[PDB]
Ligand binder design. Structure first.
Ligand SMILES: C[C@@H]1CC[C@@]2(OC1)O[C@H]1[C@@H](O)[C@H]3[C@@H]4CC[C@H]5C[C@@H](O[C@@H]6O[C@H](CO)[C@H](O[C@@H]7O[C@H](CO)[C@@H](O)[C@H](O[C@@H]8OC[C@@H](O)[C@H](O)[C@H]8O)[C@H]7O[C@@H]7O[C@H](CO)[C@H](O)[C@H](O[C@@H]8O[C@H](CO)[C@@H](O)[C@H](O)[C@H]8O)[C@H]7O)[C@H](O)[C@H]6O)[C@H](O)C[C@]5(C)[C@H]4CC[C@]3(C)[C@H]1[C@@H]2C
Ligand SMILES: CC(C)CCC[C@@H](C)[C@H]1CC[C@H]2[C@@H]3CC=C4C[C@@H](O)CC[C@]4(C)[C@H]3CC[C@]12C
Ligand SMILES: CC(C)CCC[C@@H](C)[C@H]1CC[C@H]2[C@@H]3CC=C4C[C@@H](O)CC[C@]4(C)[C@H]3CC[C@]12C
Lengths: 390, 380, 388
C-alpha cells in the first residue's frame, strides 16, 4: 500500500539469492569487451534513449537501471535452468551476455508502456517477461534450430509485441487524445541522443557477441556496421520526406537510425554481403520512419494501443523485416537451416510475445501496484523527488 | 571580507605551469620506457580511466550551478594525479619504468583523490585541489610503503585499502573547511556518471589481481553484488525519505554500495550467492545510513566511509575461513584509518591558508567564482 | 526545394550500395576500433553541442555525416589500396573509414551553424576523396610516418574546413551573431564529448600502429601528452582571461591538443618526457589560438571558424608535423626528414585546394543554406521543442 515496492523488490532479491545459491556456480577474456559494449547498451543506451520525455528523465533512466539490474539476475537463473534442464550449472561470459539480452527484451517492452506504469509493475513485468522470452528463445534455438544471432525475432519482435499487448490491456481512454506531459524538451532530446548514439555505436558487439568466433563473428560485426550506416541515411531522408516543410524530427533521428541494426540481426552472421546488409538497413530506416509517421497515430487512436517510445517502429516492424530477410537469405543460400524453421521462429516469437504480454498486462491492470492517474502520467514527481530547478 | 573573488590570473597559471615543468623535469631524470596481450592489458587501464574521468567527473556534477567545475576540475585532478603517482610509486617502490600496468596503478592512486575530492567540491578552487591531490597521493603512497615494510606485503598490492583511505581522507579534509541545490539536467548528467561507474566497477575490483582465475571470480562477484545493490538502493530509497519518494542523489551513490562491499574480498568469495548477500547487506546499510547519518557535511561521502569500513570488516570475516591474521589485518586497517585522518587534517590545515585565495563561504557551489560568463561586471 | 535533401541522401545511399556490391567482399583490434568509433560519434558530435540553439544539428549532422563518410571512405580508401580491384573488409578498413569520417567532422566544425545538411552531404563526398588521395600520397609515395595523423587528419581537416568557410564567408556574420553563443547546460553537454575524446585518444593514435613496441609507444606517448596538455590548457586559459577565470571554450578544446600534436611522433621513441613537452606546447598554442588568432581570422582574414578547429586541429597538427621533422633529426625514427616535410606541405596544400573547390560547389544557391538571421539555429532544419 505504501511499502509495496520495497517489499516486492526485497522479496525478489532474496529469491534471486536463494536461486543462485541452489543452482549457480562459477573465451572469457576474448568476449569480455563485447560484453562490456552490450552492458553499456543496456544501461546507458536504452536508459538514456527513453529520457526524451521532458518530465520523465529520472524515471526513464532509473527504472531502466532497476529493470535491467533485476533482469540480468533473473535471466541468468531462467536461461541457465533452461539450458541445464533443472540441474546446477556454471556461468561464464555467455551467461552474462544472454542475461543482458533478456534485460534488453524487457527494456524494449518497457519502452511501450513508458510513463504510464509504476516501478512495481515494472518489477512484475521483468519477472514474467523473462520467463516468456527465455522459453521462446529456447524453442527457437533448440527445437526449431533457427538462425537468429542478432535476435531480430527473439529479442526485438518479441519485446515489441509483448509490450504492445501490455500497453493495450493497460490502455487508458483519457490518454488517447494525448497528454500535456507526453512531450520532449531540448536538453531531454540531447540526453536521448546520448542513448541513441551509444546503442548505434555498440550494436555490432550486440549482434556478434554470441556468434561463432572466426568468420561468423567478423561477418556479424561488418554487416551490423554497414547496415547501421545505411539506415542513418535513409532515416534522415524519410524524416525530411514525411514531416511538414521537410524538417527533421528528433523522434525519428533518435529511433529510426537503429532500425538497420535491428533488421540485420537474423542475417548478421549469414553471408549476405556488405551490400545486402546496406539494402536491409536502408529499408529498415525507411520502414521505421514511415511507421512513426503513419502506424503510431493509427495504433494509438484506432487500435487503443499507445506506444510511448514507438518501439513497434524500431523493434517490431524492423524485427519482422529481420525474420523475413533470414527466410529470403536461406532461399538464396546465404545460410543453411530450414526456410520453414526460420518462418516458425518468426511465428513463435510474435505469438508467444502477444500471449504472454496479454497475460502479464492482465496481472498489471490490478489496482495494487501504484500506477499513476491519467493526470500524472509521464511525470517523475509521482515516484521521485524532483528538483524545483530544471 | 570581500565576497567578490580575488584575481587568480597570476596564482593559478604560475602554480600549474610550475607543477607541469617540475613533472617534465622529474620524468626526464627518473623515468624510462618499457606483447601478445597489449590491447587486453590496455583495456583494464582504459576502464579505470573511464571511471575516473567520466564516472567521478560527472557523478558530482549534480549541483545546480557547479556542474562545470565538478567535471573540469575532476579532469584537471586526474591529469595531475596520474603524473605525480607515476613518480611517487616509482620512488617508494625502489628509476621508474613506465608500463601500461604502472599507468593503471597510478590511475588507481589518482582515483583515490578523485573520490576524496567529492567531499570538498563546491567549496575549493583549483589551487586548493592541486594541494589536495599532491598531499593525498603522497600520503597514500606513504601508507602503502609503511604497510609493505611492516606486514611484508607488496607496495602495489597495498592499493586495496584505497576505498577506506579515500573516504576517511575526504571526510577529514571536509571537516577542516569553513562551513557554508539540485537541478534536473545536472541530475541526469550525474546519472550518466553513476552508470559508467557502476558498469565498470568490476574492473577496479580486479586491476591488481595477477592470475586469470582470481580476476574472473572477482569480476563475477562484483557484477552480482552491484546488481543486487542497485535493486536494493532504488527500492529502499523510498523508505529513507520524509517525502516517501525516490531520491536521485541517493541512487547516484548507493548504486556502488555492493561493489565497495565486495571490493576487498571479491577474489576470496567462491560462489555468487555470497556476493549477492554482501550486495544486499551493502544496500540495506546504505539505506540505514541515509536515514540516520544526517541526524548524527557530505552524506554520500559519509555513507561511503561506512561502506568502506564494512568492506574491510567482511574481508576480515572472510579471511579467517580461507587468530594472528585477524590481529595483523585489524592493525593494518587501523593504520590506514589513522594515516588517512592525519593526512586529511594536515591537508585541511594547508587548505585554510589565505594564499590560496579560496572562495568566500557565501559563494560556495557556484561556477561564477571560477568561470567566465557573458554580461558580467568584472573587477573594480 | 524541400525535396533536395531527401533525394540527395537517397541517391548517395544507392550509389554506396552499388559501389559496395561492385568492389567489396568479406578481432584483436576490434576494441581499439570501438574506441575510435566512440570518438567519432559521441566525442566530436557532443563536442560541437556548445551552441545554445544548434545542438540538434551538431549531434545529428555529426551522425549523418559520419555514417555517409564511413561508407564512402571505405570505398575510396579500398579502391586506392586495391588499385581498382575488389577488396576485403577487415577491422583496419573500418578504422580507416572512421578516420575519414573524423576528417570531415573536423572540417564541419569550421562551418558549423552556417550550412545545411545537403551542403554537408556534398562536403563529405568531395572531402573524403581529397583526404584519401592525400593520405595515399603521404603513406605510399612519400612513405612518411604519421601514425596519429597530425598532418593527414587534423591539419588537413582544419585547413580544408577553413578554405570552405572562407569561400562561404558571410559579411553579416563578421561582427558576431546573436545565436552564436553557448548556454550553461550546452557547455555541460560539450564536456561529454571532451571527456570521451580525451579518454579514448590513445586508441585513436595507436589503432593502426604496428603491434609490439610501436603500438605500446603510441599508447603511452599519447596518454602523457594529453596529461600534460590538460594542465597547460587550464593554466593558459586562466592566464589569458580577466581575473584568471577559466574559459569553457579553452577547457572543452585545448585540453585535447596534446592528442593532435603527438600524433606524428606517437610511435617514435620520444620518451614520456618528450611527449609531455609536446602536449604542454600544444595546450599553450591552442589556448593562444582561441584567445588571439581566432578573432584575427574572423575579423581580418574573413575566415569564420565556428568551433575554432584551427586552434585544436590546425595549429597542433602543424606542431605535430614539425615535431615529426625534429624527431627524425634527433634520430628517434628512421624515416626521411624531407619526406615528413613533404607530407606536411602536401597535407596543407591539398586541404586548401580541395576546400576551395568544395566551397565553390557549396556556394551555389541550391542546397538550402540558411540566411544570416537564421545561422546557428536548429529551427531551420528541425522540429524544435517548445521548452529547453
Ligand atoms: C500488436 C498486438 C496486437 C494484439 C493486441 O496486442 C498487441 O492488441 C492489443 C489491443 O488491441 C488490446 C485492446 C485495446 C482496447 C482495450 C479496451 C479496454 O476497455 C476500455 O477501457 C477503457 C479504460 O480502461 C475505456 O474507458 C472503457 O472502459 C473500455 O472501452 C479493454 O478492457 C481491453 C482492450 C479491449 C484491449 C484488449 C487486448 C488487446 C486486444 C491487445 C492484443 C493482445
Ligand atoms: C585556409 C587558409 C589558412 C588559407 C586559404 C584561404 C582561402 C582558401 C579563403 C579564405 C579567405 C577567403 C576569402 C575571404 C573573403 C572573401 C570576400 C568575399 O566577398 C568573396 C570571397 C573571398 C575573397 C574569400 C575567397 C576564399 C578565401 C581566399
Ligand atoms: C613547433 C614545433 C617545432 C615545436 C615542437 C618541437 C620540440 C619542442 C619537441 C618536439 C620534438 C621533440 C624531440 C623529439 C625526440 C626526442 C628524442 C628523445 O630521446 C629525447 C627528447 C627529444 C629530443 C624530443 C624533445 C622535445 C622536442 C624537441
Amino acid at each position: 500500500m505504501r511499502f509495496t515496492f520495497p517489499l516486492m523488490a526485497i522479496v525478489l532479491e532474496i529469491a534471486m539469492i536463494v536461486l543462485f545459491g541452489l543452482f549457480v556456480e562459477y573465451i572469457f577474456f576474448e568476449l569480455y569487451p563485447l560484453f562490456q559494449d552490450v552492458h553499456v547498451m543496456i544501461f546507458v543506451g536504452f536508459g538514456f534513449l527513453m529520457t526524451f520525455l521532458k518530465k520523465y528523465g529520472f524515471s526513464s533512466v532509473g527504472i531502466n537501471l532497476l529493470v535491467a539490474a533485476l533482469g540480468l539476475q533473473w535471466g541468468t537463473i531462467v536461461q541457465g535452468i533452461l539450458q541445464s534442464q533443472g540441474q546446477k550449472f556454471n556461468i561464464g561470459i555467455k551467461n552474462m551476455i544472454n542475461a543482458d539480452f533478456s534485460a534488453a527484451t524487457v527494456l524494449i517492452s518497457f519502452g511501450a508502456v513508458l510513463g504510464k506504469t509504476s516501478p512495481t509493475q515494472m518489477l512484475i513485468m521483468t519477472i514474467l517477461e523473462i520467463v516468456f522470452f527465455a522459453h521462446n528463445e529456447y524453442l527457437v534455438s533448440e527445437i526449431f534450430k533457427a538462425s537468429d544471432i542478432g535476435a531480430s525475432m527473439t529479442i526485438h519482435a518479441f519485446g515489441a509485441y509483448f509490450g504492445l499487448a501490455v500497453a493495450g490491456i493497460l490502455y487508458r481512454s483519457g490518454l488517447r487524445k494525448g497528454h500535456e506531459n507526453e512531450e520532449s524538451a531540448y536538453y531531454s532530446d540531447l540526453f536521448a541522443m546520448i542513448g541513441t548514439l551509444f546503442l548505434w555505436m555498440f550494436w555490432p558487439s550486440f549482434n556478434s557477441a554470441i556468434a561463432e568466433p572466426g568468420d561468423k563473428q567478423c561477418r556479424a560485426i561488418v554487416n551490423t556496421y554497414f547496415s547501421l550506416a545505411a539506415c542513418v541515411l535513409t532515416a534522415f531522408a524519410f524524416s525530411s520526406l514525411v514531416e511538414h516543410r521537410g524538417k527533421l524530427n528528433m523522434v525519428h533521428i533518435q529511433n529510426a537510425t537503429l532500425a538497420g541494426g535491428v533488421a540485420v540481426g537474423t542475417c548478421a552472421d549469414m553471408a549476405i554481403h556488405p551490400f545486402g546488409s546496406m539494402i536491409i538497413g536502408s529499408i529498415a530506416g525507411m520502414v521505421s520512419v514511415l511507421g512513426y509517421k503513419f502506424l503510431t497515430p493509427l495504433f494509438t487512436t484506432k487500435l487503443r494501443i499507445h506506444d510511448t517510445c514507438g518501439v513497434h517502429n524500431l523493434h517490431g516492424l524492423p524485427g519482422v523485416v529481420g525474420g523475413l530477410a533470414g527466410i529470403v537469405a536461406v532461399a538464396m543460400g546465404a545460410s543453411n537451416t530450414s526456410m520453414a524453421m526460420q518462418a516458425a521462429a518468426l511465428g513463435s516469437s510474435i505469438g508467444t510475445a502477444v500471449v504472454g504480454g496479454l497475460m502479464t498486462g492482465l496481472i498489471l491492470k490490478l489496482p495494487l501496484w501504484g500506477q499513476p492517474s491519467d493526470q500524472n502520467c509521464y511525470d517523475d514527481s509521482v515516484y521521485w523527488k524532483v528538483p524545483k530547478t530544471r | 571580507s570581500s565576497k567578490y573573488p580575488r584575481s587568480v590570473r597570476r596564482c593559478l597559471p604560475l602554480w600549474a605551469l610550475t607543477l607541469e615543468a617540475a613533472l617534465i623535469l622529474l620524468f626526464y631524470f627518473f623515468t624510462h620506457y618499457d606483447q601478445k596481450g597489449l590491447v587486453a592489458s590496455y583495456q583494464v587501464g582504459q576502464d579505470l580511466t573511464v571511471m575516473a574521468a567520466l564516472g567521478l567527473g560527472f557523478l558530482t556534477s549534480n549541483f545546480r550551478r557547479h556542474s562545470w567545475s565538478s567535471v573540469a576540475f575532476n579532469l584537471f585532478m586526474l591529469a595531475l594525479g596520474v603524473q605525480w603517482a607515476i613518480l611517487l610509486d616509482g620512488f617508494l617502490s625502489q628509476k621508474v619504468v613506465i608500463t601500461l600496468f604502472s599507468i593503471r596503478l597510478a590511475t588507481m592512486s589518482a582515483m583515490s583523490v578523485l573520490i576524496s575530492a567529492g567531499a570538498v567540491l563546491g567549496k575549493v578552487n583549483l589551487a586548493q585541489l592541486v594541494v589536495m591531490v599532491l598531499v593525498e597521493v603522497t600520503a597514500l603512497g606513504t601508507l602503502r610503503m609503511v604497510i609493505s615494510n611492516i606486514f611484508n606485503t607488496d607496495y602495489h598490492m597495498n592499493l586495496r585499502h584505497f576505498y577506506v583511505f579515500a573516504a576517511y581522507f575526504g571526510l577529514t579534509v571536509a571537516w577542516c573547511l569553513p562551513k557554508p541545490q539540485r537541478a534536473t539536467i545536472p541530475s541526469l548528467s550525474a546519472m550518466l556518471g553513476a552508470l559508467f561507474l557502476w558498469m565498470f566497477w568490476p574492473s577496479v575490483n580486479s586491476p591488481l589481481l595477477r592470475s586469470p582465475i582470481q580476476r574472473k571470480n572477482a569480476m563475477f562477484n562484483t557484477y552480482y553484488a552491484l546488481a543486487v545493490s542497485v535493486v536494493t538502493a532504488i527500492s529502499g530509497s523510498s523508505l529513507a525519505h520524509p517525502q516517501r519518494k525516490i531520491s536521485m542523489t541517493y541512487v547516484h551513490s548507493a548504486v556502488l554500495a555492493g561493489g565497495v562491499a565486495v571490493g576487498t574480498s571479491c577474489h576470496l568469495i567462491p560462489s555468487p550467492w555470497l556476493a549477492m548477500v554482501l550486495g544486499l547487506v551493502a544496500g540495506l546499510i546504505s539505506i540505514g545510513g541515509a536515514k540516520c547519518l544526517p541526524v548524527c557535511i557530505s552524506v554520500m561521502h559519509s555513507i561511503f566511509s561506512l561502506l568502506g569500513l564494512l568492506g574491510e570488516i567482511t574481508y576480515i570475516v572472510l579471511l579467517v575461513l580461507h587468530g594472528f591474521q585477524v590481529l595483523l589485518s585489524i592493525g593494518e586497517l587501523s593504520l590506514a584509518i589513522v594515516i588517512a585522518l592525519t593526512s586529511g587534517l594536515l591537508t585541511g590545515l594547508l587548505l585554510n591558508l589565505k594564499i590560496w585565495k579560496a572562495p568566500h563561504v557565501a559563494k560556495y557551489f557556484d561556477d561564477q567564482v571560477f568561470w567566465k560568463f557573458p554580461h558580467l561586471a568584472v573587477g573594480f
